[PDB]
Symmetry: D3
Subunit: 230 residues, 6 copies
């Protein structure tokens, strides 16, 4: 009855889960909370129960990339998670506007993965839950942290090569804001499994103070959403 990859039980899964790519970030996040309980660490999947503003929610690492994070998300979604927010990093696709250190709260994503397409036809949108999105924006607002909003390109290719052109410039022209590797996968799995999803991202390419802010927004949103299930 322990989940195959997360190595936690269904009973340990909270209604709200904060997901990040780097197991290292789970450790940086848990110390910002009021208290925590280390649950498991298997492969790239580190799981910790966070206690913040009177609420209880997991923080779990999902690894780099769509196929690996899908394993995490399916295990969460099929064992009781109701809300999953991804707090990640990204590149900017609008370098004149969205700069290193800026924070973007994303409502939808480009499905440049494979796993979403093995679950549902490509015409289906990768879209986040509105309430989750609204909650994230309202936490940023009350903490007086400027944020951008927009679509993320979730691509399985970190390192392009020179035979098949990358579609990033196309998507920049299409007004996509940022790029990362997991959000589209989260969104599609969430929709299929009736789990509410969202995404908040910090730009590092194309400030640890801004990371701190981003983390506070994400933790604030998780606690607010957790109250609806407690």
């Amino acid at each position: 009855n322990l989940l195959r990859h997360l190595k936690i039980s269904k009973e340990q899964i909270t209604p709200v889960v904060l997901v990040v790519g780097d197991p290292g970030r789970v450790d940086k996040i848990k110390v910002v909370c009021d208290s925590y309980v280390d649950l498991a660490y298997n492969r790239e999947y580190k799981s910790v129960e966070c206690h913040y503003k009177g609420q209880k929610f997991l923080c779990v690492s999902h690894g780099v990339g769509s196929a690996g994070c899908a394993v995490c998300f399916e295990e969460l979604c099929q064992n009781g998670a109701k809300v999953i927010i991804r707090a990640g990093s990204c590149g900017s696709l609008q370098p004149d506007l969205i700069k290193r250190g800026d924070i973007c709260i994303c409502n939808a994503a480009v499905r440049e993965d494979r796993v979403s397409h093995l679950l549902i036809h490509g015409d289906f949108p990768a879209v986040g839950d509105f309430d989750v999105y609204d909650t994230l924006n309202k936490c940023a607002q009350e903490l007086n942290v400027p944020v951008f909003n927009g679509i993320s390109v979730s691509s399985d290719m970190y390192y392009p090569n020179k035979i098949i052109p990358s579609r990033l410039e196309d998507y920049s022209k299409a007004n996509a804001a940022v790029d990362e590797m997991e959000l589209a996968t989260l969104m599609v799995i969430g929709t299929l499994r009736k789990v509410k999803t969202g995404g908040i991202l910090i730009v590092d390419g194309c400030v640890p103070h801004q990371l701190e802010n981003m983390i506070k927004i994400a933790l604030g949103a998780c606690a607010k959403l957790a109250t609806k299930y407690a």
Copy 2:
């Protein structure tokens, strides 16, 4: 300088535009407003300037289907429209839950068209603007009209045949709420052209009182959004 299909000028285009499929519905809507000015009627595209709650916005018919409505939307988006809301009909994809006469406010759509794909790669999401979506939901709330929220399948096939199976059942299993023929196209064009879009739909298959409510919600939302540009 008159738009090719709408036969109105750039000067007649308001920041907010309400779009519907049936030119007949434009006439039913304009009489609900405080006053109106008939502007043009060419092919299936009927254009009227609506006056409601102190604000000015167009109501324009777009015809049945994605290729025909894209012509309308491009003409609007490239000549000054900032916000386009589609008020339409739809079928239910969740017949146990969403019944004839129910109203659905949609945040995203399945791109089962061609024109969106001739504009941008299929992986790109058809997603509405959050503020437009929020505004529509808040008008429904203050008018005490129950609504559903969810994804619409926008399909170019009204009448299926028995050789290639329809994907509607797949999309129902994927938790799509309703189906119609234009919303995905609107959403994608809007994103590409920096125009904020949304969709409110009334189920008729798989009550004129509910139509009345739906129209009041749509008109209420248009006026609220129009104040941001006046």
Copy 3:
């Protein structure tokens, strides 16, 4: 028992039907006939019974674009139509040869739609009926009206954008003659439903005298074909 979109009954459908995009053109055509009976006008679909050279046939508008015209064509094909000719406008893909005002009678089309593909695999040809094509050419000949013949690109994209290149130049190099938005859809639906189809088109871009000629050819062809079923 009234057709859902055309709002005419099966009994009102004649063996031969002339289809056009613009409901306005139905009114310009009906007055050229010996007499007519207005039948219905719903959404963009205007239906009139035409009387010409001793024969009876409908003239029906189908609207702009493939998804909307498919609704019209399916309603006709599934309720007794045997022959459907499209009389439309188009752009030239061979600007040195085929000029504004020229008339093209088309035998086949490029399926740059979606609905045909939701009915049958893309490898299937959009091709007109030979007898219909022959009849159209022979009416042009006896009226001494020069015509071109060739393939039409039926595209769902009227207004290209600058991210995904348009395939029009490719199709021009491939020796496609003209471009419009509906003929491929008509052809494929006709083949699937055992209805004989054809297309005659007048170039306006890339003379009302030529429109007059084109209309006479189309009406002449309809009457000739109608005699085979009377």
Copy 4:
């Protein structure tokens, strides 16, 4: 200056060319003519100059399958051929109607090959020249030979397997008449190279007297078309 695969020169290519799959059939055809000149035989490509009803035209074998016949057709089309008719065998896709020994004159084809798609987008139709089609039908008529007309499925798969279902039944439901392996390729290459093409086929599965008739029709059509260039 000898063609790479046919091993004949440009000077030996006539305006009209009759193509068949089996080099053996070229020998059976040449003896039906008034006289002939053996030109070349290289790989599967046998070339003979036929003399019939006062006209001169080549008969050339193209081998089994699309990639191999494309080599033949390109060599012909790029070195002066104006008209190419394929006289072949086929299976029936309408077994209640079209029986073993029946003859089908085809106007269009399903592009279930690869080479046509490496030349032009899949949406482009594989369609024959109308005049060639008309000529074939009129020769059958004057010889009092009943023929069918319809679309051929040109498939690269002779022997299906049980993992990926064959699309033949789908195409039968779509009203395709017959199936073979080369006609779509001929049609597309012809259109691209401004060469007029056609196809006449004899059903053998799913009578040498009927083969004789079919050959007379094809030879009759070739001579008639040859007069337009002599």
Copy 5:
């Protein structure tokens, strides 16, 4: 009970079969052997029983191109063949390295055909049997003939055109060694039918002494593999 295209019986099929494109090459090969028996010649498919170094194996021509060779390979694979080696010609995709007359022993291929895709999804690799590959390399070694190794692009397009760019340059950049028209098809059919396959190729574009060497390698490999079934 005679195979439909090869016109030989199941009893005449040996465990090892050497395949070539040109029926002419079968005649050049059979005279290099210790003795031979001409079996059949139908269409482009010439079949001869070869006797070499104490072993018995067929040499069969498959024609130009994937659809035609698939017919040959299926007939062989479904009637007892255990090992099929293709001895062919090719172009060089690495012109600075791999020169006219050089020999390449190929382990895998690019599936630029259609028939393989009508048998199994495109993601499936066209890959040869390792033992066959090893055997070919070891015969070259003991005959002191330098060879290259690498991937072949098997393309259905011999003659490119100027609308759709050829992927050959892409595949050259991807480190494909050579190009021909049949090896991918052989490999995929072999895998599906549990037949061990391989390929040895001589470059002629982008020496009959080298052809002689290549033939000795292929015949040497066939005899070695034949001993495992005798």
Copy 6:
């Protein structure tokens, strides 16, 4: 100059690299070697320099899934790696033959990922280097460990759902041996970057003694290959 994800320098990269999914397995492997040096551990990427049978080679974890492992492989391939062997786990696709605990040495893979397709067209084969494959088989032989050989399905979907059928059964019918999530990606990246690749896998679904054997084979192969560059 430290690699972005591995956090090791180019100077620390050895000609031969052993890759595994689980950073935990790197620790189990390093203690089997004669000695080791822990280099880095960042995200899911653990890097250790292994010393075995007189040779030096890295062991590096790549995480679960194609997009995440591509990051690892690109960093290795673009900074001096010449040989990469994947030692992994897998499921059996031939449950009557290949059982839990069995070892499979794979020559090729099914590309059911996205990243390989963002690098090169789908028709390109995912194929391993023959010498690497041969070396692995010869180490198994000298250690008297029975192994299977065959193709792996590399799929981005660990957890199927019930809307889009999984292709695993199709691939089982096609004679694929096993399934995992990374080998196709490794193979394609290796081919593109001129790095020799291979794969050895232990079945756990559909014995730690067998794991021990598998590890000895992999370490034995790495040392043998390392001698060619030392």
